Amino acid sequence: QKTCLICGDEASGAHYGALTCGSCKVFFKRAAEGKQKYLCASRNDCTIDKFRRKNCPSCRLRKCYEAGMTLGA
Amino acid sequence: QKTCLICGDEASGAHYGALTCGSCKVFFKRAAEGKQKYLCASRNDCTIDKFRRKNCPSCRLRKCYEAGMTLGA
DNA sequence: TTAGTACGTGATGTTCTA
DNA sequence: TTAGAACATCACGTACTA
Ligand SMILES: [Zn+2]
Ligand SMILES: [Zn+2]
Ligand SMILES: [Zn+2]
Ligand SMILES: [Zn+2]
Numbered sequence: 001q002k003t004c005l006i007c008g009d010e011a012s013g014a015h016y017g018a019l020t021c022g023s024c025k026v027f028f029k030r031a032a033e034g035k036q037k038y039l040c041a042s043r044n045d046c047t048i049d050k051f052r053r054k055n056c057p058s059c060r061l062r063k064c065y066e067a068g069m070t071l072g073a
Numbered sequence: 074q075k076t077c078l079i080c081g082d083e084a085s086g087a088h089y090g091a092l093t094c095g096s097c098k099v100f101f102k103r104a105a106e107g108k109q110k111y112l113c114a115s116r117n118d119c120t121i122d123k124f125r126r127k128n129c130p131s132c133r134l135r136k137c138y139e140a141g142m143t144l145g146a
Numbered sequence: 147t148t149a150g151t152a153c154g155t156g157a158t159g160t161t162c163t164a
Numbered sequence: 165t166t167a168g169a170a171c172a173t174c175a176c177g178t179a180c181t182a
Contacts, residue, residue, distance in 0.1 A: 012148085016148095025148085025149080039120070041113065041120070042120065044114050047115070087165085088166070095161095096158070102167080102168075126158095142147070150176095155176085155178105157175085157176100158174080
């Protein structure tokens with residue numbers, strides 16, 4: 001509440017169905033749309049925060065879905 | 074050997090003191106020269122390979138120093 | 147309200163030139 | 165033989181509009 005559910009950054013309102021920051025809002029749109037497989041370099045449980053969220057699109061995307069984000073309304 | 078000591082890609086020669094590919098040669102030069110204080114999102118033990126080496130510069134650089142690479146000061 | 151655009155920035159990996 | 169620069173490409177995050 002005022003904090004992004006994906007990465008803990010300061011949130012700017014709900015986006016695609018969950019409370020997120022602006023960077024996570026645009027990341028989810030880019031990564032949900034694409035037909036990309038993302039690979040985690042560790043164990044699929046990376047810590048996603050303001051400074052680490054860049055490292056692992058796979059875990060960040062997983063967390064977006066887990067927080068309920070969706071492109072299909 | 075023909076194998077990059079950092080990421081397992083095909084090596085290109087001895088670079089900065091260790092057998093590495095071309096991408097790891099330029100990465101190490103940029104990483105050692107700049108102090109980006111790279112952060113790992115996991116446990117400082119990421120898998121570094123051709124498909125994952127972009128995920129965790131911090132662990133990739135860790136591997137470079139463990140492999141003996143150095144800028145000669 | 148929040149989704150879309152488009153920019154500016156920076157990391158990456160190779161080809162080139164020493 | 166390898167160091168280093170440059171260019172193209174791409175991921176990222178922001179400001180701005182509606
Ligand atoms: Zn976020
Ligand atoms: Zn991960
Ligand atoms: Zn390598
Ligand atoms: Zn790591």
